[PDB]
Amino acid sequence: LQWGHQEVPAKFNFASDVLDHWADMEKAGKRPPSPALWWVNGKGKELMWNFRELSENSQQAANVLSGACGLQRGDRVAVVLPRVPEWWLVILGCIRAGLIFMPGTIQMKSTDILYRLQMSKAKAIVAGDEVIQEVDTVASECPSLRIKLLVSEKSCDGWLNFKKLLNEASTTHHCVETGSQEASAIYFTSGTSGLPKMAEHSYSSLGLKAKMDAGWTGLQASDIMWTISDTGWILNILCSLMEPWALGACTFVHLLPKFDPLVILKTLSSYPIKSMMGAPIVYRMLLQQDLSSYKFPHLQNCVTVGESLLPETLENWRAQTGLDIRESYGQTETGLTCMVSKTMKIKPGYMGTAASCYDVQIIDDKGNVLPPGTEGDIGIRVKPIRPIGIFSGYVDNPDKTAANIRGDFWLLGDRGIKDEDGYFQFMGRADDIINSSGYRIGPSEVENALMEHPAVVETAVISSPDRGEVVKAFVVLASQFLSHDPEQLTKELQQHVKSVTAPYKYPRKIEFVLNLPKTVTGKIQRAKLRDKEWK
Ligand SMILES: Nc1ncnc2c1ncn2[C@@H]1O[C@H](COP(=O)(O)CP(=O)(O)OP(=O)(O)O)[C@@H](O)[C@H]1O
Ligand SMILES: [Cl-]
Ligand SMILES: [Cl-]
Ligand SMILES: [Cl-]
Numbered sequence: 100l101q102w103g104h105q106e107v108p109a110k111f112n113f114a115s116d117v118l119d120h121w122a123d124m125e126k127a128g129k130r131p132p133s134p135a136l137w138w139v140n141g142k143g144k145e146l147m148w149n150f151r152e153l154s155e156n157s158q159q160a161a162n163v164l165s166g167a168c169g170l171q172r173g174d175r176v177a178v179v180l181p182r183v184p185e186w187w188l189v190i191l192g193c194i195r196a197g198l199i200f201m202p203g204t205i206q207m208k209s210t211d212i213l214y215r216l217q218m219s220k221a222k223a224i225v226a227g228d229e230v231i232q233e234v235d236t237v238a239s240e241c242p243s244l245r246i247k248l249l250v251s252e253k254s255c256d257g258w259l260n261f262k263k264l265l266n267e268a269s270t271t272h273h274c275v276e277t278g279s280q281e282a283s284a285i286y287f288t289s290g291t292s293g294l295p296k297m298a299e300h301s302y303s304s305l306g307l308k309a310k311m312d313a314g315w316t317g318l319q320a321s322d323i324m325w326t327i328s329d330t331g332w333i334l335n336i337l338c339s340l341m342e343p344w345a346l347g348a349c350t351f352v353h354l355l356p357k358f359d360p361l362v363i364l365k366t367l368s369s370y371p372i373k374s375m376m377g378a379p380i381v382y383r384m385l386l387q388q389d390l391s392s393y394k395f396p397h398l399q400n401c402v403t404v405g406e407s408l409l410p411e412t413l414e415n416w417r418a419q420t421g422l423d424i425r426e427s428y429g430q431t432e433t434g435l436t437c438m439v440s441k442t443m444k445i446k447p448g449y450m451g452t453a454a455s456c457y458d459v460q461i462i463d464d465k466g467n468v469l470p471p472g473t474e475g476d477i478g479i480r481v482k483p484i485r486p487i488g489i490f491s492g493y494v495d496n497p498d499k500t501a502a503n504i505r506g507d508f509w510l511l512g513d514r515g516i517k518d519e520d521g522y523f524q525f526m527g528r529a530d531d532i533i534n535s536s537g538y539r540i541g542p543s544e545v546e547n548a549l550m551e552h553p554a555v556v557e558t559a560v561i562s563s564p565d566r567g568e569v570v571k572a573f574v575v576l577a578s579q580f581l582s583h584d585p586e587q588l589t590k591e592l593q594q595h596v597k598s599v600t601a602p603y604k605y606p607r608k609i610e611f612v613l614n615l616p617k618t619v620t621g622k623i624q625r626a627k628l629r630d631k632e633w634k
């Protein structure tokens with residue numbers, strides 16, 4: 100890879116360097132025993148660890164992984180757990196013992212579990228009892244897999260008993276003196292644009308970056324943050340674990356087994372949660388609940404990431420709660436990239452300014468920095484100095500990593516515009532923009548236009564070969580419209596878009612379909628549709 104060099108300490112480890120500072124303050128009486136992790140299941144069980152208990156209990160976890168499981172420094176460990184405290188303990192265990200943690204969603208099918216296990220050559224899997232049947236259907240096809248570690252109230256033959264081993268383990272573990280650029284995590288990307296990519300992160304690219312970013316949410320040392328996230332995604336490590344614990348703040352975890360928005364509302368209203376992080380969908384769902392009946396005067400900080408925060412959602416939330424939602428932007432490869440900080444003015448439709456380690460710019464085809472107000476590719480300067488926070492590269496695929504470097508910049512693959520104050524506005528995934536008859540057409544606008552029509556339940560807008568190409572809509576019809584003549588309905592839909600947007604943006608092709616392809620997270624796979632359209 101030719102992408103600069105870093106200015107980092109030789110060694111870094113979040114457990115030893117950040118977390119164990121807080122444990123030591125408590126132990127030296129320099130700080131009172133302060134809550135670190137507060138977990139509830141929504142059924143009347145709660146558990147809380149202070150910083151000393153977290154440190155002792157996660158040292159036990161490192162002992163289990165390194166001792167009982169025989170795992171050696173650099174060994175790769177898949178972690179497929181729901182929102183249970185053992186996820187936080189196991190990840191910390193991995194960090195202490197110098198093991199590469201590889202989190203995945205419990206929402207995975209057995210074919211996804213096979214793909215990840217095989218692709219990553221995982222030596223271990225840590226799972227809960229609701230995924231062990233799926234794991235065991237495919238585990239024999241995974242020749243690198245040596246250890247199956249189960250987190251459960253029950254035992255299963257073939258699986259080591261985490262909870263029992265944890266309790267037998269010493270609360271003293273000698274934390275590995277891990278290198279700042281040594282591999283700490285592998286995150287599989289969610290698969291929006293294609294097969295999941297294996298994104299390697301270092302001890303510093305996660306923990307030092309998080310340390311440097313600490314407090315961007317508005318969180319402070321005496322506060323409680325609720326990050327609402329699947330444990331399988333990078334959001335969970337960066338905001339659920341690292342942000343609060345860099346600050347000595349408490350992280351709040353609700354099992355939330357059904358992701359029920361009324362449960363989220365009740366939780367916010369019943370617990371002294373000062374800050375929350377969730378995808379835009381969380382706020383949208385909350386706005387459809389009865390916010391007159393469930394007040395949360397304690398809540399101060401509302402942040403979001405993952406997709407565009409609609410000005411409409413921002414404005415309704417403000418009206419209904421008196422709070423701002425502060426948007427952030429990034430990707431698995433880069434972590435927190437742009438954000439609206441606690442002190443910054445909120446500009447609806449904009450996702451903030453560069454995160455501190457980063458020179459984020461809009462760049463042209465040659466890698467040159469563009470003036471404000473010009474649409475281009477969003478990029479992070481990586482030469483001559485690669486900033487702390489950027490990942491280590493795609494596992495096994497250095498060609499792929501190199502292919503995203505343009506001149507001095509890492510390409511995010513997203514289009515944007517930067518305003519006069521340096522705020523970014525997201526302008527779509529670069530590969531999804533349609534070029535027809537010398538026009539550039541973004542799919543979101545066409546999709547939104549289509550969705551206004553009562554006939555349309557869901558839609559994806561993609562390029563199709565023609566005039567170079569043409570705008571095509573895939574449309575899932577409302578049941579009552581399936582009986583309509585499709586030629587006539589196509590014309591009616593084409594005419595409708597032509598009336599809400601620039602007429603050069605209308606879908607010249609419309610295909611009616613019964614479902615759209617989506618990732619495990621529900622993101623429409625436009626690439627997949629596009630690939631098939633071009634054949
Ligand atoms: N505030 C925001 N506004 C609009 N889009 C956002 C955003 N924050 C993140 N994103 C989108 O989410 C992407 C990062 O998502 P990731 O979690 O890294 C997996 P993905 O890129 O969807 O899958 P893939 O890499 O497997 O194709 C960004 O590159 C961007 O397109
Ligand atoms: Cl320290
Ligand atoms: Cl729930
Ligand atoms: Cl929204």
Ligand SMILES: [Mg+2]
Nearest residue numbers: 288292430431
């Ligand atoms: Mg991506």
Ligand SMILES: [Mg+2]
Nearest residue numbers: 550552553555
């Ligand atoms: Mg509709």
